Short mmCIF file of all heavy atoms in Angstrom, two decimals:
data_model
loop_
_atom_site.label_atom_id
_atom_site.label_comp_id
_atom_site.label_asym_id
_atom_site.label_seq_id
_atom_site.Cartn_x
_atom_site.Cartn_y
_atom_site.Cartn_z
N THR T 1 1.89 0.32 10.82
CA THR T 1 1.16 1.42 10.15
C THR T 1 0.51 0.96 8.86
O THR T 1 -0.61 1.42 8.52
CB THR T 1 2.05 2.60 9.91
OG1 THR T 1 3.24 2.26 9.12
CG2 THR T 1 2.66 3.20 11.22
N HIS T 2 1.23 0.10 8.11
CA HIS T 2 0.57 -0.45 6.96
C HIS T 2 -0.66 -1.34 7.32
O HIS T 2 -1.62 -1.30 6.57
CB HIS T 2 1.53 -1.20 6.10
CG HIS T 2 0.95 -1.78 4.76
ND1 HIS T 2 0.70 -3.02 4.62
CD2 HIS T 2 0.58 -1.09 3.62
CE1 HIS T 2 0.14 -3.17 3.39
NE2 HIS T 2 0.08 -1.99 2.80
N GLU T 3 -0.57 -2.13 8.34
CA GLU T 3 -1.69 -2.90 8.79
C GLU T 3 -2.93 -1.93 9.03
O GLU T 3 -3.96 -2.21 8.59
CB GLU T 3 -1.33 -3.67 9.99
CG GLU T 3 -0.14 -4.55 9.87
CD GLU T 3 -0.46 -5.98 9.35
OE1 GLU T 3 -1.36 -6.10 8.51
OE2 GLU T 3 0.31 -6.99 9.72
N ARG T 4 -2.65 -0.91 9.78
CA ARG T 4 -3.72 0.10 10.19
C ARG T 4 -4.25 0.68 8.82
O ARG T 4 -5.52 0.90 8.69
CB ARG T 4 -3.18 1.12 11.14
CG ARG T 4 -4.12 2.20 11.23
CD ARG T 4 -3.87 3.10 12.47
NE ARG T 4 -4.68 4.21 12.54
CZ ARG T 4 -4.74 5.21 11.73
NH1 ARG T 4 -3.96 5.33 10.71
NH2 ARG T 4 -5.65 6.24 11.96
N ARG T 5 -3.37 1.11 7.93
CA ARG T 5 -3.74 1.83 6.81
C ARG T 5 -4.55 0.94 5.86
O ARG T 5 -5.61 1.40 5.25
CB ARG T 5 -2.52 2.32 6.07
CG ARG T 5 -2.16 3.76 6.33
CD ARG T 5 -1.07 4.25 5.47
NE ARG T 5 0.20 4.13 6.13
CZ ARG T 5 1.23 3.27 5.78
NH1 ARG T 5 1.11 2.48 4.73
NH2 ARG T 5 2.37 3.27 6.47
N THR T 6 -4.17 -0.30 5.66
CA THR T 6 -4.96 -1.31 4.92
C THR T 6 -6.34 -1.55 5.54
O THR T 6 -7.39 -1.60 4.85
CB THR T 6 -4.15 -2.69 4.80
OG1 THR T 6 -2.99 -2.34 4.04
CG2 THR T 6 -5.10 -3.67 4.08
N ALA T 7 -6.39 -1.74 6.89
CA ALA T 7 -7.65 -1.93 7.60
C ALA T 7 -8.59 -0.74 7.37
O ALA T 7 -9.79 -0.90 7.11
CB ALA T 7 -7.44 -2.12 9.04
N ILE T 8 -8.06 0.52 7.40
CA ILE T 8 -8.86 1.72 7.24
C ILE T 8 -9.30 1.87 5.81
O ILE T 8 -10.48 2.19 5.52
CB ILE T 8 -8.21 2.90 7.84
CG1 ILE T 8 -8.15 2.92 9.32
CG2 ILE T 8 -8.88 4.18 7.28
CD1 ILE T 8 -7.79 4.20 9.99
N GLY T 9 -8.36 1.74 4.90
CA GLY T 9 -8.60 2.14 3.48
C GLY T 9 -8.93 1.01 2.46
O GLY T 9 -9.23 1.31 1.33
N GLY T 10 -8.87 -0.16 2.91
CA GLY T 10 -9.21 -1.29 1.96
C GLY T 10 -8.09 -1.77 1.07
O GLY T 10 -6.96 -1.44 1.33
N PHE T 11 -8.49 -2.44 0.03
CA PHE T 11 -7.44 -3.06 -0.79
C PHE T 11 -6.72 -1.99 -1.66
O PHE T 11 -5.63 -2.29 -2.27
CB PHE T 11 -8.11 -4.07 -1.81
CG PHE T 11 -7.14 -4.66 -2.81
CD1 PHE T 11 -6.12 -5.47 -2.32
CD2 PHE T 11 -7.27 -4.48 -4.16
CE1 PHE T 11 -5.24 -6.03 -3.17
CE2 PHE T 11 -6.41 -5.07 -5.06
CZ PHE T 11 -5.37 -5.89 -4.54
N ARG T 12 -7.24 -0.77 -1.75
CA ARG T 12 -6.62 0.29 -2.49
C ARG T 12 -5.20 0.56 -1.85
O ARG T 12 -4.28 0.75 -2.60
CB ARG T 12 -7.44 1.55 -2.51
CG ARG T 12 -6.86 2.62 -3.47
CD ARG T 12 -7.70 3.84 -3.33
NE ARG T 12 -7.32 4.68 -2.16
CZ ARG T 12 -7.97 4.83 -1.06
NH1 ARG T 12 -9.14 4.20 -0.92
NH2 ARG T 12 -7.45 5.53 -0.04
N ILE T 13 -5.12 0.48 -0.51
CA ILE T 13 -3.78 0.72 0.15
C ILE T 13 -2.84 -0.38 -0.25
O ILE T 13 -1.61 -0.08 -0.54
CB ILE T 13 -4.00 0.76 1.68
CG1 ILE T 13 -4.83 2.06 1.98
CG2 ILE T 13 -2.62 0.90 2.37
CD1 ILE T 13 -4.47 3.27 1.27
N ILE T 14 -3.27 -1.65 -0.28
CA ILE T 14 -2.44 -2.72 -0.58
C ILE T 14 -1.95 -2.60 -2.06
O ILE T 14 -0.78 -2.69 -2.32
CB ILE T 14 -3.27 -4.08 -0.46
CG1 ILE T 14 -3.47 -4.38 1.01
CG2 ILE T 14 -2.40 -5.19 -1.17
CD1 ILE T 14 -4.40 -5.55 1.21
N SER T 15 -2.91 -2.27 -2.99
CA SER T 15 -2.55 -2.13 -4.42
C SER T 15 -1.57 -0.96 -4.56
O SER T 15 -0.55 -1.12 -5.35
CB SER T 15 -3.71 -1.80 -5.24
OG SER T 15 -3.54 -2.11 -6.54
N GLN T 16 -1.69 0.15 -3.82
CA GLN T 16 -0.88 1.33 -4.02
C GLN T 16 0.53 0.99 -3.44
O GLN T 16 1.60 1.29 -4.09
CB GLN T 16 -1.42 2.56 -3.30
CG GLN T 16 -2.32 3.34 -4.24
CD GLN T 16 -3.07 4.45 -3.38
OE1 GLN T 16 -3.05 4.41 -2.23
NE2 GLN T 16 -3.71 5.32 -4.17
N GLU T 17 0.65 0.35 -2.28
CA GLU T 17 1.90 0.04 -1.74
C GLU T 17 2.67 -0.98 -2.63
O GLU T 17 3.91 -0.79 -2.83
CB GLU T 17 1.79 -0.51 -0.29
CG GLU T 17 3.10 -0.63 0.45
CD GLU T 17 3.47 0.70 1.15
OE1 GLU T 17 2.62 1.53 1.41
OE2 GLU T 17 4.79 0.85 1.25
N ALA T 18 1.93 -1.96 -3.11
CA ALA T 18 2.58 -2.87 -4.09
C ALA T 18 2.98 -2.22 -5.32
O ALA T 18 4.10 -2.56 -5.92
CB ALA T 18 1.57 -3.99 -4.35
N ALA T 19 2.27 -1.21 -5.79
CA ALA T 19 2.57 -0.45 -6.96
C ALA T 19 3.88 0.28 -6.86
O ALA T 19 4.73 0.22 -7.81
CB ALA T 19 1.47 0.56 -7.39
N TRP T 20 4.17 0.92 -5.74
CA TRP T 20 5.40 1.64 -5.70
C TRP T 20 6.58 0.79 -5.15
O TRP T 20 7.70 1.12 -5.38
CB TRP T 20 5.34 3.02 -4.98
CG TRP T 20 5.29 3.05 -3.49
CD1 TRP T 20 6.34 2.90 -2.70
CD2 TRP T 20 4.17 3.43 -2.70
NE1 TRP T 20 5.93 3.07 -1.38
CE2 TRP T 20 4.61 3.33 -1.38
CE3 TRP T 20 2.85 3.72 -2.92
CZ2 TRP T 20 3.75 3.70 -0.29
CZ3 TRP T 20 1.98 3.97 -1.89
CH2 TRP T 20 2.41 3.92 -0.61
N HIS T 21 6.26 -0.40 -4.55
CA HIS T 21 7.33 -1.35 -4.35
C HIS T 21 7.82 -1.87 -5.71
O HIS T 21 9.03 -1.97 -5.98
CB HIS T 21 6.86 -2.53 -3.47
CG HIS T 21 7.97 -3.29 -2.78
ND1 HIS T 21 8.25 -4.62 -3.05
CD2 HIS T 21 8.79 -2.89 -1.89
CE1 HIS T 21 9.29 -4.98 -2.32
NE2 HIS T 21 9.67 -3.99 -1.59
N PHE T 22 6.85 -2.07 -6.67
CA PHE T 22 7.13 -2.36 -8.00
C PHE T 22 7.94 -1.26 -8.68
O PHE T 22 8.82 -1.57 -9.41
CB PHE T 22 5.77 -2.57 -8.75
CG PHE T 22 5.89 -3.17 -10.11
CD1 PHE T 22 6.53 -4.45 -10.31
CD2 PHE T 22 5.53 -2.55 -11.23
CE1 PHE T 22 6.66 -5.03 -11.64
CE2 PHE T 22 5.64 -3.11 -12.54
CZ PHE T 22 6.23 -4.27 -12.67
N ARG T 23 7.52 -0.10 -8.44
CA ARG T 23 8.25 1.08 -9.09
C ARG T 23 9.71 1.13 -8.56
O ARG T 23 10.55 1.43 -9.35
CB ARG T 23 7.63 2.42 -8.65
CG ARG T 23 6.78 3.17 -9.72
CD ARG T 23 6.06 4.30 -9.11
NE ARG T 23 6.92 5.54 -9.14
CZ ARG T 23 6.48 6.57 -8.48
NH1 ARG T 23 5.35 6.60 -7.77
NH2 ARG T 23 7.18 7.73 -8.57
N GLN T 24 9.86 0.93 -7.26
CA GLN T 24 11.30 0.94 -6.79
C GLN T 24 12.11 -0.22 -7.39
O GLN T 24 13.25 -0.06 -7.79
CB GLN T 24 11.33 0.93 -5.28
CG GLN T 24 10.80 2.17 -4.68
CD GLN T 24 10.75 2.11 -3.21
OE1 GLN T 24 11.76 2.17 -2.44
NE2 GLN T 24 9.50 1.98 -2.58
N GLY T 25 11.41 -1.37 -7.47
CA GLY T 25 12.13 -2.56 -8.04
C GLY T 25 12.53 -2.29 -9.50
O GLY T 25 13.59 -2.60 -9.91
#
């Protein structure tokens, strides 16, 4: 689902997912 979401939405999806992986860390 993240592959599909990144393909549809561009680098913003990658940045957002990384951002809250960072937030959980």
Side-chain angles (χ1 to χ4, degrees):
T1 58
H2 182 254
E3 308 271 30
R4 165 164 180 296
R5 262 186 265 114
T6 294
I8 288 194
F11 180 63
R12 190 185 81 255
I13 297 314
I14 292 172
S15 199
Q16 271 173 350
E17 192 79 29
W20 79 77
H21 203 246
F22 191 62
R23 253 172 86 188
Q24 293 177 72

